[PDB]
Structure formats: C-alpha cells, structure tokens
Amino acid sequence: STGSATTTPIDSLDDAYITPVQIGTPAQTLNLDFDTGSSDLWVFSSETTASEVDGQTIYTPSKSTTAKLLSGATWSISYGDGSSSSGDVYTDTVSVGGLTVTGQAVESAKKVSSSFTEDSTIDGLLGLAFSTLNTVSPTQQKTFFDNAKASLDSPVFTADLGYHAPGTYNFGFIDTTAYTGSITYTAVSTKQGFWEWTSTGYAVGSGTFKSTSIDGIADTGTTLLYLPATVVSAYWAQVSGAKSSSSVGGYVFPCSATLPSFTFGVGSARIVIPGDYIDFGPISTGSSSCFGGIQSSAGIGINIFGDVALKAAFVVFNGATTPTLGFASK
Numbered sequence: 001s002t003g004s005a006t007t008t009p010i011d012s013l014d015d016a017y018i019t020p021v022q023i024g025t026p027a028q029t030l031n032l033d034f035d036t037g038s039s040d041l042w043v044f045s046s047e048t049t050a051s052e053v054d055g056q057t058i059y060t061p062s063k064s065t066t067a068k069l070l071s072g073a074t075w076s077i078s079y080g081d082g083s084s085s086s087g088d089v090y091t092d093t094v095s096v097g098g099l100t101v102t103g104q105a106v107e108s109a110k111k112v113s114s115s116f117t118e119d120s121t122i123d124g125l126l127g128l129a130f131s132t133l134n135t136v137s138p139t140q141q142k143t144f145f146d147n148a149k150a151s152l153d154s155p156v157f158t159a160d161l162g163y164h165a166p167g168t169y170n171f172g173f174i175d176t177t178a179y180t181g182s183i184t185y186t187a188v189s190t191k192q193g194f195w196e197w198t199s200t201g202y203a204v205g206s207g208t209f210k211s212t213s214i215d216g217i218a219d220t221g222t223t224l225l226y227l228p229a230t231v232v233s234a235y236w237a238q239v240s241g242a243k244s245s246s247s248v249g250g251y252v253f254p255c256s257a258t259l260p261s262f263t264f265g266v267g268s269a270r271i272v273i274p275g276d277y278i279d280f281g282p283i284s285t286g287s288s289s290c291f292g293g294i295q296s297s298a299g300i301g302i303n304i305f306g307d308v309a310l311k312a313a314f315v316v317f318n319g320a321t322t323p324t325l326g327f328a329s330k
C-alpha cells in the first residue's frame with residue numbers, strides 16, 4: 001500500500017504545516033501537524049476542557065463505531081517551546097492520503113496549553129519520530145508509520161514541504177518526479193528516538209564551504225533551523241544590521257535587507273536554502289525589525305534541521321531495519 005497527502009502552511013510565514021487525517025468511522029477529518037520530532041498522535045477532542053478549545057476541529061470518539069477506549073492508558077507530552085498536552089487514549093482507524101491503519105492509538109486531549117488553544121489551525125499532531133519516544137503509559141504505543149510499515153510497498157515516508165505553498169507527505173514510495181538530481185542518503189542514529197544525522201558542513205551565501213560535522217535532527221515539527229552559535233554568527237555577520245536580541249529571543253535583521261542563502265552538506269551533496277526562506281517577517285506588526293529563520297541551538301542541547309532547512313529539499317525518511325535519511329534538491 002501507499003498513501004499521499006497534501007500538507008499546507010498554516011499561515012503566510014510557513015510557521016507549521018497541517019495535513020488532513022481521517023479518524024474513525026464515519027471519518028472525522030482533522031488537520032494534524034506531522035511531526036518527525038515526536039511520536040504521539042494526539043487530537044483535540046470532545047474530552048478537551050471546553051475553555052481550551054477555540055476553533056479547532058475535535059475528534060468525538062463516541063461518534064466513531066470503530067473507536068475503543070484503551071483502558072487505563074494516559075499520555076502527557078511537552079514540546080521545545082514550553083507547550084504541552086495530555087489526556088487518555090482510544091484506538092481507532094486512521095487514514096492518511098488513502099493509507100489506512102486499523103487499531104491506531106489516537107491520544108485524546110483532556111488538557112492543552114495556551115499556545116494550542118490560541119491557534120485554531122492545528123487540530124493536534126501526528127508524530128513520525130521513533131516509537132520509543134511515545135508517551136502513552138503504561139503501554140507505549142506505536143506511531144502511524146510504525147503501524148503502517150509492514151503494509152507499505154517500501155518502509156519509507158517522504159516530506160516535500162513547500163515554501164509559501166502546499167507540499168506533500170508520501171508513505172510507502174519515493175516519487176521520482178518530485179526532486180532533481182539524485183537523493184543522497186546519510187546514516188541515522190535512533191539512540192535518542194529522533195531522525196538524528198550528521199551534516200558535513202555549511203556555506204553562507206556564495207562563500208566557501210566549511211567542512212565540519214554538525215549532528216542534528218530532521219524535525220518537520222520545528223519551524224526554524226537551529227545550529228551551533230559559531231555557524232549562526234557566521235551567517236548573520238553577512239547581513240548588515242543583524243544582531244542577536246535577548247529581548248526578542250534571537251537574531252533579528254532589518255526588514256530592508258536581502259538575505260544570503262545558506263547551504264548545508266549531506267555527505268558530498270549540498271542543499272541550498274534560499275535567503276528568502278530565512279525571512280520570518282516583522283517581529284511585531286508594523287516593525288521594521290524582522291525575525292531570522294536561522295537561530296542558535298546553544299540553549300536547546302541539540303541542533304534542529306526544522307522546516308527552514310527541510311523545505312529546501314525532498315527528504316526521505318527510510319524506516320528500514322537500519323534507518324537512513326535521504327536528501328535531494330528540488
């Protein structure tokens with residue numbers, strides 16, 4: 001089997017991408033954020049505290065003839081931005097882009113934090129990291145991909161995120177029309193539960209490539225590119241007037257600037273992020289200070305190849321017995 005679904009930016013900045021997911025019988029379609037940096041499929045639901053729901057579409061398990069409470073199971077997760085959610089668990093039928101999994105753990109939120117309530121475009125998350133990170137207790141649950149894997153034509157999924165435009169998540173096949181050149185594959189460590197890999201270096205604009213190993217994670221659930229402070233300083237030094245602002249929380253730059261590209265290495269291959277992908281717009285409405293899309297990871301503990309980087313590539317998440325990542329230009 002295969003599946004193929006379009007993923008759409010939630011706003012004009014590409015802050016996150018939501019992809020439609022069919023849950024239950026009859027189907028209830030919710031817009032979930034496919035997250036390769038986490039491993040829980042959770043949804044706003046009829047169980048979510050009413051004051052914490054503001055415009056999201058909810059899953060109502062009592063209206064699904066295939067829903068079953070997973071007795072005793074609870075979940076609770078926290079994200080890098082300080083947001084969180086928690087609740088109980090049902091199993092139900094879940095379909096993405098025509099690919100159906102029966103008995104998928106659907107984590108129903110009883111509580112979500114303020115930044116979930118404040119965004120009505122995200123109806124919950126569909127984790128695509130390794131199932132070792134799933135938070136369900138006392139019996140850890142498998143991700144949608146892990147449950148689908150055995151049925152797929154090939155044990156892979158691909159992320160083809162758009163710049164200010166829709167893109168595609170495919171399951172079970174590699175669309176050879178969706179990229180240019182060849183796909184370069186690189187080793188993955190699953191020891192932390194992430195799609196963790198090592199970039200071979202970087203370049204700023206038309207500058208020379210710096211060969212240096214940069215360990216990080218491929219994370220569709222993170223908006224920006226978070227890299228070591230040395231790398232980030234070298235990038236922003238090429239933008240007149242750019243500076244790190246403690247009050248804003250990162251590098252800002254004059255909105256009048258034209259940003260240089262940023263290249264990262266995948267083995268001997270190179271992925272070029274155009275400068276315009278690094279512009280996240282005014283820090284507040286009407287400001288002439290703009291927020292940068294490349295930021296320091298120093299306060300995180302891990303480097304993160306988020307959407308800024310991934311949207312410049314066609315990315316293969318190869319879930320074979322020894323997982324690998326593939327990157328192609330497009």
Ligand SMILES: CNCc1ccc(O)cc1
Pocket residue numbers: 016033035079081083115116122125221222
């Ligand atoms: C904006 N804070 C809630 C949130 C939204 C999306 C996501 O991938 C993680 C956290």
Ligand SMILES: CNCc1ccc(O)cc1
Pocket residue numbers: 015016081115119122221222223
């Ligand atoms: C992970 N942060 C990206 C993001 C997604 C949703 C949102 O309301 C704000 C920010």
